[PDB]
Short mmCIF file of C-alpha atoms in Angstrom, two decimals:
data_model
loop_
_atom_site.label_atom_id
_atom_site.label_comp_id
_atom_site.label_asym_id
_atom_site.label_seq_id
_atom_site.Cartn_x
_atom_site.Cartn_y
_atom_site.Cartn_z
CA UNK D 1 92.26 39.93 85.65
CA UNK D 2 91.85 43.09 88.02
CA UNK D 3 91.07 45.48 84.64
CA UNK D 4 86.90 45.48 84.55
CA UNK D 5 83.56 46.61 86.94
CA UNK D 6 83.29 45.14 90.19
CA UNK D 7 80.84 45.87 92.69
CA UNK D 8 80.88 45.99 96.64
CA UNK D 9 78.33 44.66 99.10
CA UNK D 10 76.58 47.93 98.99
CA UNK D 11 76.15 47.97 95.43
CA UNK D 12 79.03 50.98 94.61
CA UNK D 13 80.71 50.13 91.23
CA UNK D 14 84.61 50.12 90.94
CA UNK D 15 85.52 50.95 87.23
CA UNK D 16 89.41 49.98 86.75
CA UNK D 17 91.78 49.71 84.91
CA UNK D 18 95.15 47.88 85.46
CA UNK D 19 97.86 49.38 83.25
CA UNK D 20 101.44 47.46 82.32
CA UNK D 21 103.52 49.72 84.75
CA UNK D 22 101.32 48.95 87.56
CA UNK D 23 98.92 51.75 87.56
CA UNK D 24 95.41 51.52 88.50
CA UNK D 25 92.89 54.23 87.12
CA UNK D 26 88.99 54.63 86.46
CA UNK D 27 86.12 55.86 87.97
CA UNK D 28 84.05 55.00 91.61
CA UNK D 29 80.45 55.23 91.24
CA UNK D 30 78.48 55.06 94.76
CA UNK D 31 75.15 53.03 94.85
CA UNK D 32 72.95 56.19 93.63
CA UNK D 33 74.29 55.96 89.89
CA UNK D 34 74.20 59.22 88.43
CA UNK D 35 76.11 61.79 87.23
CA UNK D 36 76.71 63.37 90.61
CA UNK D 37 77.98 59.87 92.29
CA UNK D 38 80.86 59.54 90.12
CA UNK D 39 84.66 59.91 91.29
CA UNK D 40 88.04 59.72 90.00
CA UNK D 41 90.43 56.97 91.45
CA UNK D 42 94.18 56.10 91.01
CA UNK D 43 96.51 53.65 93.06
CA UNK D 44 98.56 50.81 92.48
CA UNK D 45 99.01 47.03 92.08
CA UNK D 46 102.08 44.27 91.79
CA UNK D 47 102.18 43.79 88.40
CA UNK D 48 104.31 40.80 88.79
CA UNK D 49 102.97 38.64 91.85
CA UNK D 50 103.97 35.28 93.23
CA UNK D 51 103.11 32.53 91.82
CA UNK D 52 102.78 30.08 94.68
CA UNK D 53 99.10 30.58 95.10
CA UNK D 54 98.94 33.84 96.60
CA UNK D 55 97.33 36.73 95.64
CA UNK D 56 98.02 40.33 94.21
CA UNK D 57 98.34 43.21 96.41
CA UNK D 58 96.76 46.36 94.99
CA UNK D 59 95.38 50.05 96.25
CA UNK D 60 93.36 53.40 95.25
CA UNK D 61 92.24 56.53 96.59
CA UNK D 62 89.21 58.13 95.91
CA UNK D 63 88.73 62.07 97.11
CA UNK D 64 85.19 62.94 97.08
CA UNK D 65 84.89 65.54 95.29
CA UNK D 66 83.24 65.71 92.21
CA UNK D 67 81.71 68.59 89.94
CA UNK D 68 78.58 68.20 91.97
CA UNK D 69 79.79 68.24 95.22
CA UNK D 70 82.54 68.21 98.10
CA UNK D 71 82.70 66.01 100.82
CA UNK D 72 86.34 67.11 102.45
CA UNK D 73 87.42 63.56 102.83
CA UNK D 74 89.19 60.86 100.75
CA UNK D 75 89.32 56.89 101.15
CA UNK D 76 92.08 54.40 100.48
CA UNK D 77 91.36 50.70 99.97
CA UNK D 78 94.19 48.71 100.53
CA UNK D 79 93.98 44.63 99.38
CA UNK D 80 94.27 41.88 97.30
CA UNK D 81 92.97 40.24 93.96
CA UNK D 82 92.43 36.75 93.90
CA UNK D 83 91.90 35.33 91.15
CA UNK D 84 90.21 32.30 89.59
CA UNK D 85 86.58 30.41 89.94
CA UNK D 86 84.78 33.50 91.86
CA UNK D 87 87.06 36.39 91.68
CA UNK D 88 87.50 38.91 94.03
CA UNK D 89 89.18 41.84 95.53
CA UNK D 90 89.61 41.58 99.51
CA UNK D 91 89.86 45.04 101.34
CA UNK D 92 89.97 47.17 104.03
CA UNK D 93 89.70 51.00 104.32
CA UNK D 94 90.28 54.13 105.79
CA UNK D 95 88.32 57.43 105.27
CA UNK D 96 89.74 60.70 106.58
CA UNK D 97 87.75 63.80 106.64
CA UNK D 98 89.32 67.40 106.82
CA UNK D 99 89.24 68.24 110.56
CA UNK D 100 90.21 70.90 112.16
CA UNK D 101 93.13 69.96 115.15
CA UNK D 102 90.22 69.55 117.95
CA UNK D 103 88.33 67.38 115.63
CA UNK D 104 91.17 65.52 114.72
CA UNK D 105 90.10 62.07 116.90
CA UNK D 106 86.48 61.22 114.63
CA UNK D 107 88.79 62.14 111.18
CA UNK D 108 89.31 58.63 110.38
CA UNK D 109 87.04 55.65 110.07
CA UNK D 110 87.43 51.50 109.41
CA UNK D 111 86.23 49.51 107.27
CA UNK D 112 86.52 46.47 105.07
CA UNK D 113 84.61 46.01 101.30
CA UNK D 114 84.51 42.86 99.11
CA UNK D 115 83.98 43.44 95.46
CA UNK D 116 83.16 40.83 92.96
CA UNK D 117 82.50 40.89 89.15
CA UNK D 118 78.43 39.96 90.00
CA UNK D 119 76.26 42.90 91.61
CA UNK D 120 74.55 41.94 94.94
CA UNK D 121 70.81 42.85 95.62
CA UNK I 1 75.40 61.02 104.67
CA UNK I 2 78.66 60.12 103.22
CA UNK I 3 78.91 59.33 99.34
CA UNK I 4 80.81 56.67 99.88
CA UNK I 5 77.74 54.87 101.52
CA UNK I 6 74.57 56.78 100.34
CA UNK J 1 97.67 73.68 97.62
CA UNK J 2 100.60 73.77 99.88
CA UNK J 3 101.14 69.80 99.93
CA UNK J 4 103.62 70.32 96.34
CA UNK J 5 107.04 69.65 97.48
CA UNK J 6 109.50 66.95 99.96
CA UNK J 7 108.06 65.59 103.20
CA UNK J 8 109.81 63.72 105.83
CA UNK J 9 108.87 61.25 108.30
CA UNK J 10 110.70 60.00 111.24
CA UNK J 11 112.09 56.99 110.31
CA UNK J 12 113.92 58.44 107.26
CA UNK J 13 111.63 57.92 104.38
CA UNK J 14 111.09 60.73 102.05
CA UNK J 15 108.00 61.66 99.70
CA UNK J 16 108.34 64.12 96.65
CA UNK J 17 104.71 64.82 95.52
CA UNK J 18 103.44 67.33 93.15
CA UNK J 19 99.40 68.28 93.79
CA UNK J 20 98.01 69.01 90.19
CA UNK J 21 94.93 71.54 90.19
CA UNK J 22 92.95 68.89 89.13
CA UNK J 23 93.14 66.82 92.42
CA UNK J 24 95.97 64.38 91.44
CA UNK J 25 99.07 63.45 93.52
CA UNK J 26 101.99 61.68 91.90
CA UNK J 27 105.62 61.43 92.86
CA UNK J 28 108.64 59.21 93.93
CA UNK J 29 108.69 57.12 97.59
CA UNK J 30 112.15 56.84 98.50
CA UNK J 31 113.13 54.28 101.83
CA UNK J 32 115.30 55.37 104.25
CA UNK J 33 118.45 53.97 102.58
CA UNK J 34 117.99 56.49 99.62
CA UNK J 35 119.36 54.70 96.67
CA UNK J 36 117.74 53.76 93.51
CA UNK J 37 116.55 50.69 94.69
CA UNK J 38 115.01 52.02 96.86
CA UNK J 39 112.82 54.37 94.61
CA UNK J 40 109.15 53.45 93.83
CA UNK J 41 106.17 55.67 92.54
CA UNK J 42 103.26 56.90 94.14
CA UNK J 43 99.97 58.12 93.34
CA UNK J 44 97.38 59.63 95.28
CA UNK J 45 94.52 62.12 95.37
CA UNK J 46 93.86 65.15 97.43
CA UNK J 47 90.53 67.59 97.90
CA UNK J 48 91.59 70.52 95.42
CA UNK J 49 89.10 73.30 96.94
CA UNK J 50 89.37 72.35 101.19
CA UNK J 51 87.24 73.95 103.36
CA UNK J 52 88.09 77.64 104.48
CA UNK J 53 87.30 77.18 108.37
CA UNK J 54 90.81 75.66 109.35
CA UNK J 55 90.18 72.40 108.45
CA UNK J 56 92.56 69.93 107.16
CA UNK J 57 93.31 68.74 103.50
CA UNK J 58 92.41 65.64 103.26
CA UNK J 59 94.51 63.50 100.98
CA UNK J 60 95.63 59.89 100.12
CA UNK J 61 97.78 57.98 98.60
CA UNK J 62 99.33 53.96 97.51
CA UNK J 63 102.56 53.03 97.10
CA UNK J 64 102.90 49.26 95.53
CA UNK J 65 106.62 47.40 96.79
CA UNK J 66 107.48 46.91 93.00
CA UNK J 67 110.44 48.87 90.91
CA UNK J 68 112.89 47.31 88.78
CA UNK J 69 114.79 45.97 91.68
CA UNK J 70 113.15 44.17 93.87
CA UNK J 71 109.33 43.16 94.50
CA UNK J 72 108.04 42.99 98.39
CA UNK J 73 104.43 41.84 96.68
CA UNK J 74 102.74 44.22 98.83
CA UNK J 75 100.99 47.62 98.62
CA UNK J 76 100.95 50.10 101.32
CA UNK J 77 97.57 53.16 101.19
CA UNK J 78 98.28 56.48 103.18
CA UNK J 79 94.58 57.98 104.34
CA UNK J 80 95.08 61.38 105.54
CA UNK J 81 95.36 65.19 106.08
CA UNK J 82 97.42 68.31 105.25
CA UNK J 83 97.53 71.09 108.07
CA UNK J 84 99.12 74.14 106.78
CA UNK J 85 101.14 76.87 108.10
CA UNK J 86 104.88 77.53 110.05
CA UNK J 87 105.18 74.15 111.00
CA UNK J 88 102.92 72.22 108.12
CA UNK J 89 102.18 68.53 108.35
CA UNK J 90 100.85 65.72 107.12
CA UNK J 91 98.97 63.59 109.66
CA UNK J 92 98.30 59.88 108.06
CA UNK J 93 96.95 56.42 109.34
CA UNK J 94 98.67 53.25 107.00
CA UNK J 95 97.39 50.06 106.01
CA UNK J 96 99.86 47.71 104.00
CA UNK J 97 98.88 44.46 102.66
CA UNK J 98 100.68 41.88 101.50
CA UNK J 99 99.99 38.86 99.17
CA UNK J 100 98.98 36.08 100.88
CA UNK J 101 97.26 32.16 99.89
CA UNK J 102 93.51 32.23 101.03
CA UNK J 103 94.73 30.56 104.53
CA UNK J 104 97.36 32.86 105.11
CA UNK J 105 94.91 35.96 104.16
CA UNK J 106 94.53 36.87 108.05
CA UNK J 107 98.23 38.41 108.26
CA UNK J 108 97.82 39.89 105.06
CA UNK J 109 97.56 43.62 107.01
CA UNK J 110 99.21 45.62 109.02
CA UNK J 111 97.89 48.91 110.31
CA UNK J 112 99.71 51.46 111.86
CA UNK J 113 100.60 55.80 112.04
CA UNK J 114 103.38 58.40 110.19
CA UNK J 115 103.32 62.02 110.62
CA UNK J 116 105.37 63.80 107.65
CA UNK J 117 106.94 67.13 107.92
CA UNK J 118 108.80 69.73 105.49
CA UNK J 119 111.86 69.29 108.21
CA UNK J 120 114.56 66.07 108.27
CA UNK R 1 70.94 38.39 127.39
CA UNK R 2 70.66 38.03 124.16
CA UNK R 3 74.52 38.14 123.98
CA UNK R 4 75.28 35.41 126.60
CA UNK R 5 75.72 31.99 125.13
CA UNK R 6 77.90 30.45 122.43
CA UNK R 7 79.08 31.74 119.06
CA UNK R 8 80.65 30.22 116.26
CA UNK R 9 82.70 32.52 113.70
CA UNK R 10 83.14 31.19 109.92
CA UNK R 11 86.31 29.34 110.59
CA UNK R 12 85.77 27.46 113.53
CA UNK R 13 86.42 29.46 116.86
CA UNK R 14 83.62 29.48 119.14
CA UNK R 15 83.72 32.20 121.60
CA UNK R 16 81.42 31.16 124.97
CA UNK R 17 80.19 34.54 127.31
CA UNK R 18 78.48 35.36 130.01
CA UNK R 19 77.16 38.95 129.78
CA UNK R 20 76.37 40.48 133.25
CA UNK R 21 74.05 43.17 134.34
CA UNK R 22 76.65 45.45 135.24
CA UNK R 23 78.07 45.64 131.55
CA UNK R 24 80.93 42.58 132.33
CA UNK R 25 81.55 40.27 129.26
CA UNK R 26 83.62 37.33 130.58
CA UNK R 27 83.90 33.64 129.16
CA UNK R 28 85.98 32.01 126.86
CA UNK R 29 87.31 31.71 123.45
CA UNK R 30 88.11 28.48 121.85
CA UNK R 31 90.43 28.30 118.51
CA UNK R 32 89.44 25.86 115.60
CA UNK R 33 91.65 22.91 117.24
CA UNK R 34 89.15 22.37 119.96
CA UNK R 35 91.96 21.59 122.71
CA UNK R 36 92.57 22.04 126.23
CA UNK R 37 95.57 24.05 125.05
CA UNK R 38 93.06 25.99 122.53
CA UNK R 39 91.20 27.25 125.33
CA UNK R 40 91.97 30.80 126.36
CA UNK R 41 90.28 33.62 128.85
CA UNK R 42 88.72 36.50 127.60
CA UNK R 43 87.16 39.72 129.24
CA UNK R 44 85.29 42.96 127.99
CA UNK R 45 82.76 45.30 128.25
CA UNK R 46 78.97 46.54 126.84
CA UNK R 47 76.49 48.79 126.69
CA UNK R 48 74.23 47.74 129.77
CA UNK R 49 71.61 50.03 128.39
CA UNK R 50 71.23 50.46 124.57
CA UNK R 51 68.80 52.11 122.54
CA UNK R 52 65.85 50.13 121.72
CA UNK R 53 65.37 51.77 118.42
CA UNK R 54 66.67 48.77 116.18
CA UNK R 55 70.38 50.09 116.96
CA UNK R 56 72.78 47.87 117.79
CA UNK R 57 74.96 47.24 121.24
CA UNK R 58 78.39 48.70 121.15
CA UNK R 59 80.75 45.91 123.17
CA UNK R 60 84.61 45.10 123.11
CA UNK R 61 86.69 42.14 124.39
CA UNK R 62 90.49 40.84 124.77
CA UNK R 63 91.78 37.99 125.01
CA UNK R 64 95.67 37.44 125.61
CA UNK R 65 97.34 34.22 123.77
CA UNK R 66 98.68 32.84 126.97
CA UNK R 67 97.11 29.97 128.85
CA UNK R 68 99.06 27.11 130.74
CA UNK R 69 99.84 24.91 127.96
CA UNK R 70 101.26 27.96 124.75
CA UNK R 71 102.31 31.73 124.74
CA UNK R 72 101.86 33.54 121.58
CA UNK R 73 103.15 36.86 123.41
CA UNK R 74 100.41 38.58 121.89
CA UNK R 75 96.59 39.80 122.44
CA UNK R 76 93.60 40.54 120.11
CA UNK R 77 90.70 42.95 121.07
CA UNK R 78 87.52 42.63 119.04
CA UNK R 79 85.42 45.87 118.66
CA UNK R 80 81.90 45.71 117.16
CA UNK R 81 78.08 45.51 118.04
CA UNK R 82 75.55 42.70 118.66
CA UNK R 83 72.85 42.99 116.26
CA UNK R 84 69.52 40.93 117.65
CA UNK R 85 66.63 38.88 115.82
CA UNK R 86 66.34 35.59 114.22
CA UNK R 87 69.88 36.02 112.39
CA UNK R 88 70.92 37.50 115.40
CA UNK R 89 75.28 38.52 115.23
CA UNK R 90 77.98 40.47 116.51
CA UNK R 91 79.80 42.45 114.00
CA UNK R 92 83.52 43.03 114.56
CA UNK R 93 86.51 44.44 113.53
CA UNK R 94 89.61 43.43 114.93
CA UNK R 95 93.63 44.19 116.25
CA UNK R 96 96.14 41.65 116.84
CA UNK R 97 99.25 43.28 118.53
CA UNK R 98 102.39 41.13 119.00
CA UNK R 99 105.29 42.00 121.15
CA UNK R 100 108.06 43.06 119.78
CA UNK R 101 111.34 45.19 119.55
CA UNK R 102 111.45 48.71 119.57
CA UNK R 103 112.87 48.52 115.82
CA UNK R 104 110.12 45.89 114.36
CA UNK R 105 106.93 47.55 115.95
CA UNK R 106 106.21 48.13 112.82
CA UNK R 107 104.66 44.91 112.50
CA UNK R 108 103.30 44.96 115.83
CA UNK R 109 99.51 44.86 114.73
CA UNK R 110 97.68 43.20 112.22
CA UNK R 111 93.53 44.53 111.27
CA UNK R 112 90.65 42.65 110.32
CA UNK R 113 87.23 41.71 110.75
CA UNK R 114 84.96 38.79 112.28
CA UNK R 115 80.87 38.43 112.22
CA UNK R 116 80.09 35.76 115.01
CA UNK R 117 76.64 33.97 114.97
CA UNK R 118 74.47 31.61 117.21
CA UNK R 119 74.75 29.03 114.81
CA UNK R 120 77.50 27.10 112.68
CA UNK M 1 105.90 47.69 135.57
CA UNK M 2 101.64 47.68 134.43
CA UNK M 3 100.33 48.71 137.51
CA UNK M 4 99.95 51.53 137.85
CA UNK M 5 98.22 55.43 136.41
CA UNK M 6 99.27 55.99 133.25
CA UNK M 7 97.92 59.05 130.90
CA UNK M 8 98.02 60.00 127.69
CA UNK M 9 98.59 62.85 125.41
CA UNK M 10 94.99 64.32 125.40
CA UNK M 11 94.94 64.23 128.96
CA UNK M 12 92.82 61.10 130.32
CA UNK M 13 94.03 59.04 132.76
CA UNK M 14 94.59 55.24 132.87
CA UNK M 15 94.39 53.75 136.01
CA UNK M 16 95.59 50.41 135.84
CA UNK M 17 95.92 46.83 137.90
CA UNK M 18 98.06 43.52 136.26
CA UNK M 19 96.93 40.71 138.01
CA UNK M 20 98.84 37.41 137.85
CA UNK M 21 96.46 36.10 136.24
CA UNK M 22 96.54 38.19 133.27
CA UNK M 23 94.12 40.10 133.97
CA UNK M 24 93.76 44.26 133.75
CA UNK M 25 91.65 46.24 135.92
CA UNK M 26 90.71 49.58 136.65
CA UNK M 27 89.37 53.08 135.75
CA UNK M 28 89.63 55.21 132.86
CA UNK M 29 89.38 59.17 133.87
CA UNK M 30 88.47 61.34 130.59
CA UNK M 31 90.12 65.03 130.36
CA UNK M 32 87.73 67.01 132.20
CA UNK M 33 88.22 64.36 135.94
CA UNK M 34 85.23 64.97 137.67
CA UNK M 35 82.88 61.88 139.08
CA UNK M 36 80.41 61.72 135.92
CA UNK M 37 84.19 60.86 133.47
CA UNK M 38 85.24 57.72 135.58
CA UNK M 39 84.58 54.60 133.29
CA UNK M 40 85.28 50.83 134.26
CA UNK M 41 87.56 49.09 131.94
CA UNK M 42 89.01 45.51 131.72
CA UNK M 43 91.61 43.82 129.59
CA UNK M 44 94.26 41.03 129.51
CA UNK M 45 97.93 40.93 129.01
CA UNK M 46 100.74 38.63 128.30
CA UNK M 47 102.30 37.78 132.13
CA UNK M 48 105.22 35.77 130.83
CA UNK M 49 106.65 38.10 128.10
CA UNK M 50 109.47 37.46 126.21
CA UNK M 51 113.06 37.93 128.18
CA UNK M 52 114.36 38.88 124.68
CA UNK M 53 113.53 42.85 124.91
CA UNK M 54 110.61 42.68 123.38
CA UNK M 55 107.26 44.55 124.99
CA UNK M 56 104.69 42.83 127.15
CA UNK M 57 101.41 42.66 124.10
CA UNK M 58 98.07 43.70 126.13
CA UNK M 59 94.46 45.15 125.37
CA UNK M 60 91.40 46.56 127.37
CA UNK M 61 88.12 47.72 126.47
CA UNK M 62 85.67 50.99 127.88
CA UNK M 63 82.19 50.37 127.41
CA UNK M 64 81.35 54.70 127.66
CA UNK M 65 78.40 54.14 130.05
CA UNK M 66 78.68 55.22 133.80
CA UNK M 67 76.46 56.14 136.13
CA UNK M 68 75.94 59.26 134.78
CA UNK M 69 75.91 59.22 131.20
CA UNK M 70 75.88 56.93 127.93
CA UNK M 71 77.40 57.56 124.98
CA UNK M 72 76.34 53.93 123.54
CA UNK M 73 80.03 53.08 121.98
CA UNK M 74 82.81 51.01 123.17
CA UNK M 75 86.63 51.51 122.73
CA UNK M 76 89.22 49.09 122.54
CA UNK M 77 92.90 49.72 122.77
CA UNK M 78 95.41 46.98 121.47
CA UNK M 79 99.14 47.34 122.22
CA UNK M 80 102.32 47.01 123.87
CA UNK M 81 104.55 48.30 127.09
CA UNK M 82 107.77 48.90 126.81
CA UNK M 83 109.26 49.09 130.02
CA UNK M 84 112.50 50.46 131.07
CA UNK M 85 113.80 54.08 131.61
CA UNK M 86 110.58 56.24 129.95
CA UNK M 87 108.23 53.36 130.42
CA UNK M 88 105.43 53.78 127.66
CA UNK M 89 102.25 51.58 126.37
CA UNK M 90 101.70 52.23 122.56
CA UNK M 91 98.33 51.56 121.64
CA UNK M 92 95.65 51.68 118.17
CA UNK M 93 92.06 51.95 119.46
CA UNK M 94 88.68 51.42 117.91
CA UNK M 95 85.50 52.97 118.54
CA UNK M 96 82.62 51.75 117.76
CA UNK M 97 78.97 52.86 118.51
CA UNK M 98 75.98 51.31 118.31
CA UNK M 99 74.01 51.95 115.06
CA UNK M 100 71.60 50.73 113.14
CA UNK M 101 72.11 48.34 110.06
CA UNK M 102 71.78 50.82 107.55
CA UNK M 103 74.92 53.34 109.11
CA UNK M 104 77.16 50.27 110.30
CA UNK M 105 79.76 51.18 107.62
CA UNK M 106 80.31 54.49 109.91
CA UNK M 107 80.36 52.85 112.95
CA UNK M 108 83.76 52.82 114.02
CA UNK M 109 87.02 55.12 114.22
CA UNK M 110 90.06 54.44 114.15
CA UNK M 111 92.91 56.15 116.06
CA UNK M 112 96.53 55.78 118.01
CA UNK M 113 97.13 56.97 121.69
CA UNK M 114 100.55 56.19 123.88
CA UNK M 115 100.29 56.82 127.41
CA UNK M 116 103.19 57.59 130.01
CA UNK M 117 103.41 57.80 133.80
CA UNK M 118 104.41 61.45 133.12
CA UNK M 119 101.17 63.55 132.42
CA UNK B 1 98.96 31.89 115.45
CA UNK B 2 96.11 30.19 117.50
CA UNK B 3 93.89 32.65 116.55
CA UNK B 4 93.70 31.06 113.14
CA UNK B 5 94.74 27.61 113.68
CA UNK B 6 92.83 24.40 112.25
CA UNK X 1 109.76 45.25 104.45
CA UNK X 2 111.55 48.28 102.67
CA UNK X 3 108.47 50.45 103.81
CA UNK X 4 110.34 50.37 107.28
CA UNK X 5 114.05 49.87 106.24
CA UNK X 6 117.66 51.24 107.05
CA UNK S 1 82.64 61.54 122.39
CA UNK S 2 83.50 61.10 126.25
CA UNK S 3 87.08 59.50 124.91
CA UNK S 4 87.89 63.04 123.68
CA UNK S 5 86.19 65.72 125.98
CA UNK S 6 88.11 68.79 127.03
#
């Protein structure tokens, strides 16, 4: 059920898909929609989960650097699909920009994204 | 501005 | 890039990573008790053209707890940076979920640090 | 203030603070079982003086699982901002940090995130 | 054991009392130590830790406003000390600052400090 | 964990 | 967890 | 940031 589009809270668009060997791969589009706001992802997912009722753990990078442009930084979402009625994928992040060793304390930032198969306004 | 969020 | 090789980090574990020119990162996680089931395969991305002013590389990467072994049911994502030179490193910030029902779904994640180095 | 008072998170806590003049959050936090032994002390800090530009108010609290009746040898600080106005809430993210062994501090601290509002 | 200045490996100071009550108290002293870098924290700790070696779990929070300045953030650090020969408190931290709603999803760092008695 | 207890 | 294993 | 001055 992961392979698809989803969409996060602030509209970005999560193309994946979910190979038999446990590979994610596809494309991260931010909110703006064109050409220039689209990024190459990879990660990984259990491609055998539990089946007591719990969900499956998954993750992807994204660096941010396109044809267009170079932000110095790259994001990993680390989470879990859950499946059924309303489907969703539960994360959290971390985005580390290129620093130099003084800088090195604001390289990372927190976060946390829900993506569904429905786009939010 | 970060892409991630723009 | 700088990054292609085996890194280290202090609790035993060992990464071998190639950086394609393209941006891509894939290799082999091995745990610190080094046999084959202890093997499982990671892919990442990095920034292929960094800045020039000393800054880092930034780079990251999943692992999911699954080979032909054994399954933990978890996924762990690396978010980080490469600093080059004599005494290179990798500086990273972890975040590993874990499977978990809907009411168990609050100690789905740990957080926590590794530094990797080109050294045991 | 507008942060003193009670608020309710999605799952039942209720968290109930006074915020003082000198930047002192103090007060209580109250898990979903609504208990004397679900009662439990909490302390923090925020900005005294924030912007008045539609920004929100930076503020922090702890509390540590301990009161006279259970000991969960552990403590949670909450990190976020109060956001004001009819749907008024305070925005957090969260670290839950258990005691343990040198050898298992791996899975010392868990992440994740709470929004708190005035009403259930 | 708590009580007591502590420092970590950028070079602020923690100055720190454990009350019976749980509670933590003091001062933290940023890098550069003069009067406009003194910050009032507060926090909470487990007083009846676990006899089986395991740390003592605690957590404080710095709102960064003093007399003198304000940087409109607040950092909190959630942890453990490990007592002992080398007594150390490993800690994550997160800062956030105050923002408005559209730049929330930037509004707080993430990082890892461990302090010692020994600066 | 009382945090998340019902 | 073999993330943190001996 | 305060938390990081030199």
């Amino acid at each position: 059920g992961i392979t698809g589009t989803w969409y996060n809270q602030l509209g970005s668009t999560f193309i994946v898909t979910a190979g038999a060997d446990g590979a994610l791969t596809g494309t991260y589009v931010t909110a703006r929609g064109n050409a220039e706001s689209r990024y190459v992802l990879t990660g990984r997912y259990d491609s055998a989960p539990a089946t007591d009722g719990s969900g499956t753990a998954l993750g992807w990078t994204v660096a941010w650097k396109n044809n267009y442009r170079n932000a110095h930084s790259a994001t990993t979402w680390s989470g879990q699909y859950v499946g059924g009625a309303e489907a969703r994928i539960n994360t959290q992040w971390l985005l580390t920009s290129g620093t130099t060793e003084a800088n090195a304390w604001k390289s990372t930032l927190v976060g946390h994204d829900t993506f569904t198969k429905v786009k939010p306004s | 501005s970060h892409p991630q969020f723009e």
